[PDB]
Write an enzyme that holds these catalytic residues in place. Structure first.
Site, mmCIF file in Angstrom:
data_model
loop_
_atom_site.group_PDB
_atom_site.id
_atom_site.type_symbol
_atom_site.label_atom_id
_atom_site.label_comp_id
_atom_site.label_asym_id
_atom_site.label_seq_id
_atom_site.Cartn_x
_atom_site.Cartn_y
_atom_site.Cartn_z
ATOM 1 N N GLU A 30 -2.779 -8.834 -16.567
ATOM 2 C CA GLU A 30 -2.151 -7.811 -15.746
ATOM 3 C C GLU A 30 -1.038 -8.438 -14.910
ATOM 4 O O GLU A 30 -1.298 -9.322 -14.096
ATOM 5 C CB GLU A 30 -3.186 -7.133 -14.837
ATOM 6 C CG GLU A 30 -2.581 -6.109 -13.848
ATOM 7 C CD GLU A 30 -1.667 -5.088 -14.528
ATOM 8 O OE1 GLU A 30 -2.079 -4.478 -15.544
ATOM 9 O OE2 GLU A 30 -0.529 -4.892 -14.049
ATOM 10 N N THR B 118 0.813 -1.222 0.000
ATOM 11 C CA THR B 118 0.000 0.000 0.000
ATOM 12 C C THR B 118 0.852 1.280 0.000
ATOM 13 O O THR B 118 0.372 2.354 -0.375
ATOM 14 C CB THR B 118 -1.001 0.039 1.179
ATOM 15 O OG1 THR B 118 -0.291 0.062 2.422
ATOM 16 C CG2 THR B 118 -1.937 -1.170 1.151
ATOM 17 N N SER C 198 -5.038 -3.146 -7.520
ATOM 18 C CA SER C 198 -5.701 -2.388 -6.478
ATOM 19 C C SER C 198 -7.021 -1.891 -7.042
ATOM 20 O O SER C 198 -7.055 -1.246 -8.089
ATOM 21 C CB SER C 198 -4.835 -1.209 -6.040
ATOM 22 O OG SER C 198 -3.628 -1.654 -5.439
ATOM 23 N N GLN D 216 -9.354 3.910 -0.148
ATOM 24 C CA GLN D 216 -10.681 3.809 0.427
ATOM 25 C C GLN D 216 -11.376 2.565 -0.115
ATOM 26 O O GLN D 216 -11.446 2.366 -1.332
ATOM 27 C CB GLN D 216 -11.498 5.058 0.105
ATOM 28 C CG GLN D 216 -12.657 5.284 1.048
ATOM 29 C CD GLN D 216 -13.498 6.491 0.666
ATOM 30 O OE1 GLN D 216 -13.155 7.244 -0.252
ATOM 31 N NE2 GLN D 216 -14.610 6.682 1.372
ATOM 32 N N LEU D 217 -11.856 1.725 0.800
ATOM 33 C CA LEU D 217 -12.537 0.468 0.463
ATOM 34 C C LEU D 217 -11.716 -0.423 -0.472
ATOM 35 O O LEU D 217 -12.276 -1.115 -1.336
ATOM 36 C CB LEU D 217 -13.917 0.746 -0.149
ATOM 37 C CG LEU D 217 -14.849 1.640 0.668
ATOM 38 C CD1 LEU D 217 -16.078 1.971 -0.162
ATOM 39 C CD2 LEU D 217 -15.235 0.963 1.977
ATOM 40 N N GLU D 218 -10.396 -0.413 -0.290
ATOM 41 C CA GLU D 218 -9.502 -1.113 -1.196
ATOM 42 C C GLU D 218 -9.679 -2.619 -1.153
ATOM 43 O O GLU D 218 -9.656 -3.239 -0.080
ATOM 44 C CB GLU D 218 -8.030 -0.763 -0.956
ATOM 45 C CG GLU D 218 -7.110 -1.557 -1.885
ATOM 46 C CD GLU D 218 -5.683 -1.056 -1.912
ATOM 47 O OE1 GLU D 218 -5.327 -0.180 -1.092
ATOM 48 O OE2 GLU D 218 -4.913 -1.560 -2.756
ATOM 49 N N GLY E 201 -12.149 10.606 -10.696
ATOM 50 C CA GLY E 201 -11.744 11.717 -11.567
ATOM 51 C C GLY E 201 -10.847 11.329 -12.737
ATOM 52 O O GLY E 201 -10.513 12.174 -13.570
ATOM 53 N N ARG E 202 -10.452 10.056 -12.794
ATOM 54 C CA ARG E 202 -9.577 9.529 -13.855
ATOM 55 C C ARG E 202 -10.348 9.342 -15.175
ATOM 56 O O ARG E 202 -11.565 9.177 -15.153
ATOM 57 C CB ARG E 202 -8.962 8.199 -13.403
ATOM 58 C CG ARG E 202 -8.307 8.265 -12.023
ATOM 59 C CD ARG E 202 -6.820 8.548 -12.088
ATOM 60 N NE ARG E 202 -6.067 7.299 -12.090
ATOM 61 C CZ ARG E 202 -5.687 6.639 -10.997
ATOM 62 N NH1 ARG E 202 -5.966 7.113 -9.790
ATOM 63 N NH2 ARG E 202 -5.017 5.499 -11.114
ATOM 64 N N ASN F 23 4.570 -3.223 -8.768
ATOM 65 C CA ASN F 23 3.783 -3.484 -9.975
ATOM 66 C C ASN F 23 4.548 -3.110 -11.235
ATOM 67 O O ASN F 23 4.402 -3.754 -12.275
ATOM 68 C CB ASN F 23 2.436 -2.759 -9.931
ATOM 69 C CG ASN F 23 1.498 -3.329 -8.881
ATOM 70 O OD1 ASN F 23 1.604 -4.493 -8.511
ATOM 71 N ND2 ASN F 23 0.570 -2.506 -8.402
ATOM 72 N N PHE G 259 -10.352 7.358 -7.555
ATOM 73 C CA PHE G 259 -10.474 6.824 -8.908
ATOM 74 C C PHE G 259 -11.419 7.624 -9.798
ATOM 75 O O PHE G 259 -11.242 7.662 -11.015
ATOM 76 C CB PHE G 259 -10.996 5.388 -8.852
ATOM 77 C CG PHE G 259 -10.005 4.381 -8.323
ATOM 78 C CD1 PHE G 259 -8.661 4.420 -8.704
ATOM 79 C CD2 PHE G 259 -10.433 3.357 -7.479
ATOM 80 C CE1 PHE G 259 -7.755 3.471 -8.233
ATOM 81 C CE2 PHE G 259 -9.535 2.401 -7.002
ATOM 82 C CZ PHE G 259 -8.193 2.458 -7.379
#
Ligand SMILES: Nc1nc2c(ncn2[C@@H]2O[C@H](COP(=O)(O)OP(=O)(O)O)[C@@H](O)[C@H]2O)c(=O)[nH]1
Ligand SMILES: [Mg+2]
Lengths: 207, 170
Positions: free
Chosen positions: A125, A36, A130, A168-170, A141-142, A43, A139
């Site tokens: 992948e 985290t 995540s 958040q809520l990952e 606004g992406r 990655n 996320f």
């Protein structure tokens, strides 16, 4: 049909309910906490090597092993929708500076090319994935939003509680996972590509 | 004599294709990426019958204990990158570092292999930068294609020669 959480508190309750059952070891927790903080690096090296880890230094390869094995303890009890946001480079280096119009909308030429490249196709992948239980601010606004349909029993860990660095809520998904892109459409905005994918699973299944 | 070769290099560089080209004189495309196998065949190396052993590593799941074990047992290394993938060239330093860490011998038989030479049209890694790295590492650089067979036998035979020379002392 996949559960899609419409409320943060509900998502948290669900996540906590899973997390309580994990019984992660100290070293597994440390590996996840580290992730985290260092996801970009881990990655990145996974993607650089297309998943090959035998050139990884002691610390990193041990962390990878711990992460991989932690998923034996972390499964979704239920079909679940997971979300992540991505920047243009997710679609390929050729989209990096090309996806967006000057006015912030997705260029329709670029979009059609991305659709041609990815629609109705499997994608592998190399990094861990995540995601979040919801389309969180991190996320939302992406320019690319991916909705992953994750089947009951799939490896998926709610790691929000484990680390202050956790999104958040990952929900973390195992590395080397394949998903199939079912749908790609523009937001009503025209400012986002919304990708719907079915998670197929990971090649990384340590006994 | 048995010369134990290990294939190393990022996923997709052509380790499997190179191994199968050497072993069976065939171009095998999209060999299962996460699948490892060991091969052995008798060859005549400069007049003498010897056996080569090749471990075609997958590597995606080769944790510390595993990779350390086969790095230790391996006598020579084909460190493969693809000339069309700079990231794979960059990664060669990593494989070599981890090899050097376990073997604790900078004179370990080692060839830098720039694979997919048939894809000159897609080249991302300059011959210059690869040769410079090879020189820096005191190793030979060879450009290969598992597709056209270009220098494929050469890399295996050259490596065997290096392993054989290393074995000459003791
Ligand atoms: N054009 C070309 N393709 C190659 C060559 N070597 C391997 N490939 C292809 O590149 C991809 C990866 O090859 P592979 O042998 O599986 O690489 P590995 O993952 O390192 O074992 C496959 O689609 C192969 O068919 C080559 O010399 N030339
Ligand atoms: Mg292979």
């Amino acid at each position: 049909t996949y559960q899609e959480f419409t409320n943060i508190d509900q998502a948290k309750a669900w996540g906590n309910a899973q997390y309580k059952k994990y019984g992660l070891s100290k070293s597994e927790k440390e590996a996840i906490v580290s992730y985290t903080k260092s996801a970009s690096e881990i990655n990145g090296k996974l993607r650089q090597n297309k998943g090959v880890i035998n050139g990884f230094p002691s610390n990193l390869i041990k962390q990878v092993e711990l992460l991989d094995k932690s998923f034996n303890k972390m499964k979704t009890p239920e079909n679940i929708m997971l979300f992540r946001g991505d920047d243009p480079a997710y679609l390929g280096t050729e989209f990096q500076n090309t996806l967006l119009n000057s006015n912030g909308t997705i260029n329709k030429t670029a979009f059609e090319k991305a659709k041609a490249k990815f629609l109705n196709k499997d994608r592998l992948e190399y990094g861990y994935i995540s995601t979040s239980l919801m389309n969180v601010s991190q996320f939302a606004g992406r320019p690319i939003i991916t909705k992953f349909k994750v089947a009951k029993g799939s490896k998926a860990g709610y790691i929000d509680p484990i680390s202050a660095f956790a999104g958040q809520l990952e929900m973390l998904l195992p590395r080397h996972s394949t998903y199939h892109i079912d749908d790609m459409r523009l937001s009503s905005d025209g400012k986002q590509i919304i990708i719907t994918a079915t998670m197929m699973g990971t090649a990384i299944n340590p006994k | 004599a048995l010369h134990k070769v290990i294939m190393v290099g990022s996923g997709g560089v052509g380790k499997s294709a190179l191994t199968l080209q050497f072993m069976y004189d065939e171009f095998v495309e999209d060999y299962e990426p996460t699948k490892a196998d060991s091969y052995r065949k008798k060859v005549v190396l400069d007049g003498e019958e010897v056996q080569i052993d090749i471990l075609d590593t997958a590597g995606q799941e080769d944790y510390a204990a595993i990779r350390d074990n086969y790095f230790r047992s391996g006598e020579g290394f084909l460190c493969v990158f693809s000339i069309t993938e700079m990231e794979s060239f960059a990664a060669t330093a990593d494989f070599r570092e981890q090899i050097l860490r376990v073997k604790e011998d900078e004179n370990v038989p080692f060839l830098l292999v720039g694979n997919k030479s048939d894809l000159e049209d897609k080249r991302q890694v300059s011959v210059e930068e690869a040769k410079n790295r090879a020189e820096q590492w005191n190793v030979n650089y060879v450009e290969t294609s598992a597709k056209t067979r270009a220098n494929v036998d050469k890399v295996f035979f050259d490596l065997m020669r290096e392993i054989r020379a290393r074995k000459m002392e003791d």
